[PDB]
Design a protein around this ligand. Sequence first.
Ligand SMILES: N[C@@H]1[C@@H](O)[C@H](O)[C@@H](COP(=O)(O)O)O[C@@H]1O
Length: 366
Amino acid sequence: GDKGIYRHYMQKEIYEQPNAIKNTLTGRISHGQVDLSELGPNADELLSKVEHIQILACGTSYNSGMVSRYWFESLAGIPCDVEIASEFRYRKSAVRRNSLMITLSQSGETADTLAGLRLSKELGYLGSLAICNVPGSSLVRESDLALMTNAGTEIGVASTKAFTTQLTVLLMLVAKLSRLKGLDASIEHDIVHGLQALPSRIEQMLSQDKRIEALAEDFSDKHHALFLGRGDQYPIALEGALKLKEISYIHAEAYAAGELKHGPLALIDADMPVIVVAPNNELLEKLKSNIEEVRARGGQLYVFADQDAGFVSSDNMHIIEMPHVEEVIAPIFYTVPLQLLAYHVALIKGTDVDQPRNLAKSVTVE
Ligand SMILES: N[C@@H]1[C@@H](O)[C@H](O)[C@@H](COP(=O)(O)O)O[C@@H]1O
């Protein structure tokens, strides 16, 4: 129903992120630990028998997963593999010892993943956790366990609150598994703190909103962009690029920041801004140096970084300062400026934000 004070559902969806995240934390946090016993009185020796994760979705959902793979592998120490649903459903895959099947999805109707799960039944999958946002549908029903992200319905065609909430649940799950494995419990609380920080850290970004409306102008009449990201921020480059493709129709493409010099450098000029997401200092010095290599074709570096990094803008490296956040939820945090950025370009360009062209709420049908 009602958009409220908003021009577009997507806008609202972006501004709802702080609440939506509260709801995803309604009684999952309790006594400063993570409580996933909302999952059958069964549940736990299952989840403690796990020594490998296979995640499986499409689109913005693969992005979120792609992110959570970093976490798991380093926080919870549990091997993690992510794959595009379609890629999985059309190969003889080599199942892992005690693999858990997480399928991520907003609609729980995405044919390609739905199917990716149905192939897993017959393959040796320890069991099946479907993180997802629409109450009781194919992906929910057909899984052993579900974690309904509860963000209200999302009407916009590209996903915003859906994404962040999936990352929060990812983060809980990372937490629950870390302790149910024996790991020094300082780890779970870090995640938790970070997790209860998060909602008001999103409202912080949102106020730094006007500053993005500014930057959008720089990109509103471009038709190329290169998003760059390292480790957990890379999949945020993925999502950021995707959002730009999606609603501004710009051809933004994401990339391992390690890999710039192995190709796309050759592409950069005044019509293809680079954007790095949340670099550290040693990364900046590499990218800064790269971009000089192309000052003469007129290329620019745009950097979203911690205001605390003390980075300084040159004539062709432009720092866009963000507030400090906790390392552990950084990935989730740096997503909002990228969403808002896509959003403002779209607004200025005047494109159909809520239903972008040729794009679908979900691909159910074959
Ligand atoms: N337009 C949507 C997206 O916004 C989303 O990232 C993707 C996966 O859909 P789901 O999360 O419902 O599995 O597919 C659709 O194309």
